[PDB]
């Protein structure tokens, strides 16, 4: 099944309205400073005041 | 105050000190033209026309209206004739009206 008429530059742009991205939530790890995405462990390897990994 | 005047073939409602555009009058800039035909000068209605009544105007300028570019085109039948037109006009304003 093919298009019978080309979908113009107007209909296409409207479809992509819902394609925009979301800014993912960001938290600031305590025990160092940086913006780790929230509910993860930052590159410190420290999650909260507990150690779960190596230096970076 | 007002008056109704037949200049060219169009009847105009005209007060003191108003500028209106009529069809070409063959009269150079700055001269005073006395439009002759008139009806309903001031509460005084001439039936055919108001006799011995004129409106005295000073011609301001001769101009050409905006271009009208008429193209006529029979559909699917070998015809695309084109023509352009710039109707000339004269803009003029009134000084006072002869009673």
């Amino acid at each position: 099944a093919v298009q019978q008429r080309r979908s113009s530059k107007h209909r296409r742009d409207k479809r992509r309205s819902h394609d925009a991205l979301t800014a993912q939530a960001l938290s600031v790890c305590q025990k160092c400073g940086k913006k780790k995405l929230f509910h993860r462990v930052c590159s410190c390897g420290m999650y909260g005041d507990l150690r779960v990994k190596k230096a970076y | 105050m007002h008056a109704i005047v037949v200049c060219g073939s169009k009847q105009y409602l005209v007060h003191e000190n108003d500028t209106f555009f009529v069809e070409k009058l063959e009269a150079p800039v700055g001269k005073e033209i006395q439009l002759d035909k008139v009806l309903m000068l001031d509460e005084k209605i001439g039936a055919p026309y108001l006799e011995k009544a004129r409106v005295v105007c000073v011609v301001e300028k001769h101009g050409l209206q905006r271009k009208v570019n008429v193209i006529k085109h029979i559909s699917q039948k070998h015809h695309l004739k084109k023509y352009g037109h710039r109707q000339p006009y004269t803009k003029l304003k009134v000084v006072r009206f002869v009673h």
Partner: protein
């Protein structure tokens, strides 16, 4: 060329009205209502500015249809489904829903247009004498 015709624009001022549709007939009332809404009778009718007045119609159920129409002429309404014809009769319209009758009879008299749907909302058809639109201070005139 010539002096441009005068045409009011957003210079609209609209006064309410009241007509008590006691013993009038449907269509003769409806044309007068349609003209009053459109402002067709205004001395300065600009065809694109809703220069017309508001209107409130009272005692809708008392309006009368001449002849035997009360049992012979039907009003139809169709949903987009199949078998969705709802077919009601003049006697049943003068009892069950009377305001809808005058509303529809008025709307059809307006042009297929973009103010028609904005004109028609200037018609308030209460079924009975009482109303809650005494606040707007309407005038009152007979048979319009």
């Amino acid at each position: 060329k010539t002096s441009m015709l005068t045409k009011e624009q957003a210079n609209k001022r609209r006064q309410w009205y009241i007509v008590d549709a006691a013993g009038l007939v449907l269509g003769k009332l409806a044309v007068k209502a349609a003209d009053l809404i459109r402002g067709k009778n205004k001395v300065d009718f600009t065809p694109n500015q809703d220069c017309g007045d508001y209107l409130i119609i009272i005692n809708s159920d008392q309006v009368v249809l001449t002849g035997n129409k009360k049992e012979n002429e039907f009003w139809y309404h169709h949903s987009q489904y199949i078998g969705g014809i709802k077919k009601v009769s003049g006697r049943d319209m003068l009892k069950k829903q009377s305001d809808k009758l005058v509303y529809n009879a008025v709307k059809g008299m307006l042009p297929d247009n973009r103010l028609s749907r904005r004109w028609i909302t200037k018609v308030h058809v209460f079924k009975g004498d009482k109303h809650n639109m005494e606040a707007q201070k309407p005038t009152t005139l007979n048979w319009s």
